[PDB]
Amino acid sequence: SPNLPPGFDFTDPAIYAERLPVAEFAELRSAAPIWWNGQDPGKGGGFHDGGFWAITKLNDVKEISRHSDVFSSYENGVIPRFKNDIAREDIEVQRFVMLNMDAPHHTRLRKIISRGFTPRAVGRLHDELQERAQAIAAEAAAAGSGDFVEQVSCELPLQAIAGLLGVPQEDRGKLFHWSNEMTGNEDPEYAHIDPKASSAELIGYAMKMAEEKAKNPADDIVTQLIQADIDGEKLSDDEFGFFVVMLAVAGNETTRNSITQGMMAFAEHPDQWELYKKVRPETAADEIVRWATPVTAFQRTALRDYELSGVQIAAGQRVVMFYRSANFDEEVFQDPFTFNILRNPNPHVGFGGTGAHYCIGANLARMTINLIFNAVADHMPDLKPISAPERLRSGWLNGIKHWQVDYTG
Ligand code: HEM
Ligand SMILES: CCOC(=O)c1cc2cc(-c3ccncc3)ccc2n1CC1CCCCC1
């Protein structure tokens, strides 16, 4: 029924290198909110099961996220697209990080790692991130023009991870280098990167950091993570290393692409940009995340038969939650295609559907976004784009590689 091209794959990186398949996502919400996306032989992005169920409705995304007992993140990982020829064991490597664990293993890890995302712990970063956000902005304005991504979006998200982990200043340069080589392998601009090499360098440094803190324990997030709680629970040295590797991407290109596409949206909607500069509403962060949806989609795997909204899902089959579609569901949003930074409440799923795996760094991201746009307004309120943004070739990330901008006008 649904009017779609033969051979169409919603995880095809060819599409996302050009555009977002908004019209195609809308077609399914009307004609087939849960639609079997078949994949030709050898074109499964690393999965040889023949296709997956596209999930386009927000309520369906929420049901899958909260029914993590049926819909597993471990079985096949949550990334729904790699290079088609990727070895299976390269996919299973994901299972070493919390994102791709099921309960009970995931439950133990999440509980320990929560010590580093308490509201207090994130608040201690406000002043330092505000200071840097202002300086980044001032630095870019002085340049007159350049790559908005590298000059505005790139650094601060990484400074949040470093500050959260108490990484020494002199170490941050190489730490950022490694973190930025973790994803984007499919884009021709980054074909030469080896995410496996830089990850090993990341774990080696993180494990090194963990054994030093045990011998010289101070008050910071790293020490609380490697010390036994009242329950005797804590992160082993390697578990802390897989924690760092997870942050290096989970809080890197996600927050970055939200800053970029957030500024892109402000350029598209001058009314909203004048409004922001005057009142600086912090509800803008959630609207920027909904508008940007930096993670286009994560997948799950059904461990048993499951009926979801009148559609039979069979054990072993993959379901791909398309957050880019759920965040523009006409059923839950009044004018989903209206950029409204005052939108309140705003139940977007850019941080995922509520449930076990809901982004632990959601509020840190919100604060990063708010601090940097306040700085953009303070230091370059009349910036205008020079050329169209350059999109990233990815099957699940909605990335912006470059964006030329004039900060003077
Ligand atoms: C705009 C910024 C961000 C977006 C769009 C985003 C998106 C997401 C999504 C969709 C998930 C999976 C949710 C699910 O499976 O139900 C997730 C999980 C996660 N995020 Fe984020 N995230 C952002 C920022 C951050 C930051 C700044 C950090 C840390 C510094 C972070 C750390 C994590 C971690 C550790 C997980 C795994 C949680 C688990 O598996 O239990 N994220 N994020
Ligand atoms: C020992 C584990 O370390 C890794 O190898 C690794 C972890 C990881 C996590 C994310 C990630 C993505 C999104 N949201 C949060 C996290 C993306 C890529 C990742 N990789 C590299 C990649 C190399 C080979 C194929 C899969 C893994």
Author numbering: 19 to 427
Give sentences from the paper.
These sidechain‐modifying reactions are catalysed by the cytochromes P450 CYP125A1 and CYP142A1 (CYP125 and CYP142 hereafter). Comparison of the effect of complementing a CYP125 knockout in the CDC1551 strain of Mtb (which does not express the CYP142 protein), with CYP125 or CYP142 reveals that the two enzymes are functionally redundant with respect to growth on cholesterol.
The introduction of a methylenecyclohexyl group on the indole NH, compound 7, maintained affinity with both CYP125 and CYP142. This is likely attributable to the ability of the additional carbon to facilitate positioning of the ring closer to the plane of the indole, as opposed to compounds 7 and 8 which extend at an angle of 67° from this plane because of the geometric requirements of the single carbon linker.
